[PDB]
Amino acid sequence: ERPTFYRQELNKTIWEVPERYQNLSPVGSGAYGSVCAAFDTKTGLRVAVKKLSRPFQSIIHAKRTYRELRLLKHMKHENVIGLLDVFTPARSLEEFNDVYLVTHLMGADLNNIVKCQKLTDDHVQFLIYQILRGLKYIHSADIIHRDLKPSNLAVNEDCELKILDFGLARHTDDEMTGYVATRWYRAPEIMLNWMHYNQTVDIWSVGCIMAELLTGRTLFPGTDHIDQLKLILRLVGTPGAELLKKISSESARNYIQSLTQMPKMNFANVFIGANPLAVDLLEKMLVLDSDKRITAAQALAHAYFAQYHDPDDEPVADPYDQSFESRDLLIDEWKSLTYDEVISFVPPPLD
Template sequence: MTEQPAEKIKPNFYRVELNRTIWEIPERYQMLTPIGSGAYGQVCSAFDQQLQHKVAIKKLARPFQSEIHAKRSYRELRLLKHMEHENVIGLLNVMTPTLTFEDFQDVYLVTPLMGADLNNIVKCQKLTDDHVQFLVYQVLRGLKYIHSAGIIHRDLKPSNIAVNEDCELKILDFGLARLADDAMTGYVATRWYRAPEIMLNWMHYNKTVDIWSVGCIMAELLTGRTLFPGTDHIDQLKRIMELVGTPDQEFLQKISSESARSYVESLPKQSKKDFRGYFQGANPDAVDLLDKMLILDTDKRLTAEQALEHPYMRQYHDPTDEPTAAAYDDSFEKMELNVAEWRKLMYEEVEGPGRAAGGEGLGPEAMEQ
């Protein structure tokens, strides 16, 4: 880790090199340690001297290299800014080191640092039924909030759900998965948790795609193994049908894609397995909840709100403490802008209102998250 003389960056920012990448961040963030990197950015943990605890800082990777990247970066910032809920990752700070719009290239997002994700938890320990209840309750509580804003997660899986040592949980990376992005992600495991209607492009999907994913995750928490570990889309569907049965006529009529409908009709007919036998030894209420989440017909699948009212959630459910969100304005999704225009919107979002004094940061309410 080498420090270099700072030039043309804001006062109280410093420059440091990590993994051959230059980071330029406020002095309040010290002890930067790389913890991950992906197609869309690098992430470090850091100690925030102002808040006196560790945070995660993400440096977006060349956010303005293309229109797709620019729009995705803008989407990520807008979504994070909108979220204020205990079970959903929110934004503590956003900053750029540059003094002027002309030099604006880099964006840093600061979020709470979470320890393990559900993947680590499932691998490391056998969970008690009470544990599973508490974890699933928090996922549903977070989803109720996200869905109330009109946002669909679309890519809920164990690695997108972070948990700290007190078993407190936050949902990450919501709303970022778009069909255009699918080819870019390349994560095979994603499909294991994906609702059949989104995976096979059957129809216009709704918020219950996320409930299917919760069902898959909950089954894994209960049994310690992946529910539908398909090797490809066809194998995935085969495994799903073996458990939940082939769709009835009523549901087949709802599949708008003709090719998808004739393919599903050509599959050997299978009846639904008895979930009580399949999840032997599990709490009967847990099995009943799974039964109502893992339903092919999206109109019959539970919503997050309905799932919170299920008897399995009785111990934790509190309607007075399951908040909803303000409506989220996603009209930008329909906008076809060039890179320069996205860059201008992004700059306004980073440097615009709701900022702390000193040229960086959000207001005090965000700082307390």
Template sequence: MCSVNFLNSPSNAGFSAANRERVRKRAEASPTRSLPRARSLPPFPLNRPHLSGRNSARGQSARSDLKSRAAMQSPVRNSPVRPGFHRVEVQKTTWDVPERYATLLAIGSGAYGTVCSAIDQKTKEKVAIKKLYRPFQSLIHAKRAYRELRLLRHIQHDNVICLLNVFTPDSTLEKFQTFYMVMPFVAQDLGHIMKRKRLSDRIITYLFYQLLRGLKYIHSAGIIHRDLKPGNLAVSESCELKILDFGLARQTESEMTGYVVTRWYRAPEVIFNWMHYSQAVDVWSAACILAEMITSTVLFPGHDSIDQLKKILNLTGTPDSSLVQKMQSKDAQSYVQGLPSQKKKNFKLVFPTMNEKALNLLEGMLLLDPEKRLTANQGLAHPFLSEYHDADSEPDSKPYDDSFESLELDVGEWKSLIHMEIMTFDPDNPAQTAM
């Protein structure tokens, strides 16, 4: 399984035994520097993962037992289904799933799919099952579905969501119309937690360390997440963090057009199309999340794109001439050059109560020029995270093959590739079948 407790799992290849023992000794010797305990987090009743999309706003509260019962599965009698599968109805939607998955409960929906929690009767663990909405309705949808599946198959890291299973109820390629992805169940996201309680310094440091640890792994594979925000970070009761939702990862610029997402955590070069994206966009988002964890306030809550830029430049100052020259969009160059000149604010005055080490790290991650921003790897080595940093337990990814991005295929060909991925996946050994 990919849900691994950092301290208690002797088989955790990503977090060395020596480092676990070192952290344990620190915890015993110095309560003020100990690893955050599960009891440090308040209980949260809302158990649902986050999907990008308007129907999954992170502030939504649990309704009532009556509504929960309405979201439960209902068996569909006398319905033909593939052997080894059973058919249930969840909120008027038909789900055909293997018999090992029981007690389906709707927990979220987004632009591209619906998610149910379920009990895996083979492992006795709770999982999340994602059913994609009509994945083959268009070329864009088919390629997006293949991209997400390939990414999830590749990822094997404690701080990033992984794929436990993928299946289709359709018995042949000719009948293939839908598929489901099974992932670890996540009880709460960072957005929910921050709405409920102010985080302690110890928890902030530990969570941010795990965020950068996961980012380093993703970036080493050449993957850009592009939609990091509190709602896309799952946090367990024992303070273990996982990066979620790769729906926008590696997205081509043409597909990004018109896509509505939270802009508050987006790097300025993404919002205004200054230049081609790099992994630095995720570093900017991570910095915004760090500032929000510390201050309990969104750092750049812009009402629209123009207001977003104003709020960013009010802190960072206007771009210097060297950055303007790097902008590949002439319109962006003209617009920025027409802005009134602003100097960078003194971060100590803007964040007077912030820890000096955190302040220094934040400044290095919030540089306007993406080429000058700290990388995730450099952030891990920063003194702010020295309590947990151990280069030997911060693994890189194996090379990720994204050559398919340049393929010009039709819907049927993308469907065939997805079907092949599903047929070659072994749920009993998901790590061994990673592409």
């Protein structure tokens, strides 16, 4: 049965949500979208409720709305955002116009724990173990996060971790310009558009994250794209002929060859005092040639995580059809597709 909704103005927009959800107040800072924290009286959980802004204004927006909902409906893993609820005040497709998504209230992200608290090597094991576990699941559904950084990683007081915010509304050229965390964790091949990328790009982001937990400092805080490439190549060495061949972007390949050849540095001298096993993993994550990176599944078996590795408890995802991605539909067609996904939503099992 359809619940009763109540209406309230919450920062310039009218939120219409089911009565179960009480005590809504704006959260983040406008940084996650229109997000409210709330109390869910049916489950006793503190939740974040996102109302999607103008979800069907264009074909791009309609498809994006469909994308996000699809993705969040699929994800059922301890180390990944799960969809608690999705709803609309609309009793029909004709009145359908707003989508609302509900997940667990985050509270703290990984910047908060790196900036404000001090991390033992065993915290870094556990934190990275969990990112890689959720990544194994995601990548097994041929999903690519593309935007892993500390700020879309939720951590609770027990240092338990979720991957959130698949970053779905891709970034503006301007958001990616200058001295910004939005670019510091990106694999070189996407930052500079060297080749058709793939899921190996997230492993690079993991390396950057792991180095910063170990050191307390950003691995490659470039003042811009080029300055950041320089930081990267200084640590990792300039590419060889093998990696150059793979760079499809003739222009990008011609630029790299302008640079003076540099050898890969000794990570034991970069990460002084670090656990040798941490250093060894880092060397295998932070590989310029992405074909040669350690995968999430290979990385879970790495000796650094022996404390936590259980191969009978590192699950894969059900198959994820994203054939819709290469599909050209009109606004109303995406919109109806979305509406059906709202209507078919089944809540997660109760404990």
